[PDB]
Design a protein around this ligand. Structure first.
Ligand SMILES: [Ca+2]
Ligand SMILES: [Ca+2]
Ligand SMILES: [Mg+2]
Ligand SMILES: [Mg+2]
Lengths: 349, 67
């Protein structure tokens, strides 16, 4: 349907992509919550830029032509005049990802990004090439660019008057496709009815209880009440992915973090609709509910299992989950919210 | 044997509302959602089978101990 409200527009998620998110949220009957996507990544994700996984840890750049990418020179990243203790730590991150599948590509923006870039205020003042910007960074490096019979613009630069430019380097795909932010999912609230089969497969061999008994035990039903509680436990246990959250999952050679069977499914249903509207994968790992380094952000974008979109403050998040749990949606929290008094539970704990 | 924090997550699945107790309506919903349509009669029977203390509901201890 396209951006349908303000929430959709502030989420930083490309429309086409968000259209699938909503469609899948309803296909699987699961409420999907995401952390905000920085706005300088939205355009990239939409035209086909690849998204980054957990193996990559080189802070991105928020200024210059390079905004939206993960620059190889950390001085180009969101770390421009910091400390040599820091600029060194960033060298490492760069290093890590460069030995492991990640390439160092030559930054070349697209005609359109050039638009977005100039339209957003990140860059000016170019004869077409010699651009300008009041971002501290420009008082240390000189930027420029040149077209090609490719339409794209190649990013060059030098440290301030000791010439010779080079081709700006960013971290990219093993397939060469440069990396931009990935849509970090905050949590997935699946309707309990999504686990009926899981329970059965584990307890009745895929059979409804009534069919199981009639097949294995001839004609107060003590054994039947026992069997019921059994798929009842199995359903919840699959619903919250107890078993599966004990290990790590892997997409090929990429660690997708801690993730339940159902969340993985969603990830695939989602990355799917992304490919269909012209993008690459956008969800590279499990949800924030299983992130050992939980982050605090006042706003979170939510997509009901009904397609309704809204922005939620932590407080409205609590009441939200509560209402959703009354409708039979399952939710479990990151395991450290408790100790740091940040739990979304008004129960025993 | 799942850990204790593991058993509480699964427990919240049953405990739809605030309080840390499993009601008969909470169970009747859980069963229906998981593919079993049961009578109020059979519903009270699953509760009864787990209700060690006889208070009509399944608390935390009786859920974990059901095993
Ligand atoms: Ca209750
Ligand atoms: Ca009791
Ligand atoms: Mg991520
Ligand atoms: Mg992701």
């Amino acid at each position: 349907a396209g951006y349908a409200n303000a929430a959709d527009r502030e989420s930083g998620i490309p429309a086409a992509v968000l259209d699938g998110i909503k469609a899948v949220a309803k296909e699987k009957n699961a409420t999907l919550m995401f952390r905000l996507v920085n706005p300088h990544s939205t355009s990239l994700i939409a035209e086909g830029v690849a998204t980054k996984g957990l193996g990559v840890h080189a802070k991105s750049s928020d200024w210059g032509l390079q905004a939206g990418y993960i620059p190889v020179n950390p001085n180009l990243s969101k770390l421009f005049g910091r400390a040599p203790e820091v600029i060194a730590r960033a060298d490492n991150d760069v290093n890590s990802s460069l030995a492991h599948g990640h390439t160092a590509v030559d930054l070349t923006l697209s005609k359109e990004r050039l638009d977005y870039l100039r339209q957003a205020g990140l860059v000016t003042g170019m004869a077409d090439g010699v651009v300008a910007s009041n971002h501290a960074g420009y008082e240390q490096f000189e930027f420029r660019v040149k077209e090609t019979s490719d339409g794209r613009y190649a990013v060059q630069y030098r440290r301030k008057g000791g010439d010779d430019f080079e081709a700006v380097k960013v971290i990219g795909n093993a397939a060469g496709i440069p990396l931009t932010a990935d849509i970090d999912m905050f949590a997935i609230m699946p309707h309990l009815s999504n686990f009926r089969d899981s329970a059965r497969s584990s307890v009745t061999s895929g059979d409804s209880v009534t069919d199981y008994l009639a097949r294995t035990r001839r004609a107060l039903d003590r054994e039947r009440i026992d069997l019921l509680w059994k798929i009842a436990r199995a359903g919840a246990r699959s619903a919250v992915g107890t078993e599966a959250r004990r290990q790590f999952r892997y997409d090929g050679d990429m660690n997708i973090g801690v993730i339940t069977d159902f969340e993985l499914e969603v990830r695939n249903a989602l990355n799917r609709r992304a490919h269909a509207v012209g993008a690459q994968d956008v969800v590279q790992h499990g949800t924030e509910q299983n992130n050992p380094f939980p982050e605090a952000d006042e706003k979170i974008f939510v997509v009901s299992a009904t397609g309704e979109s809204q922005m939620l403050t932590r407080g409205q998040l609590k009441e939200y989950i509560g209402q959703q749990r009354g409708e039979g949606y399952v939710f479990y929290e990151n395991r450290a919210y408790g100790v740091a008094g940040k739990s979304l539970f008004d129960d025993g704990l | 044997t799942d850990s204790e924090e593991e058993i509480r997550e699964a427990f919240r699945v049953f405990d739809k509302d605030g309080n840390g107790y499993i009601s008969a309506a909470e169970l009747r919903h859980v069963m229906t959602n998981l593919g079993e349509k049961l009578t109020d009669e059979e519903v009270d029977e699953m509760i009864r089978e787990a209700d060690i203390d006889g208070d009509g509901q399944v608390n935390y201890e009786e859920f974990v101990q059901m095993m």
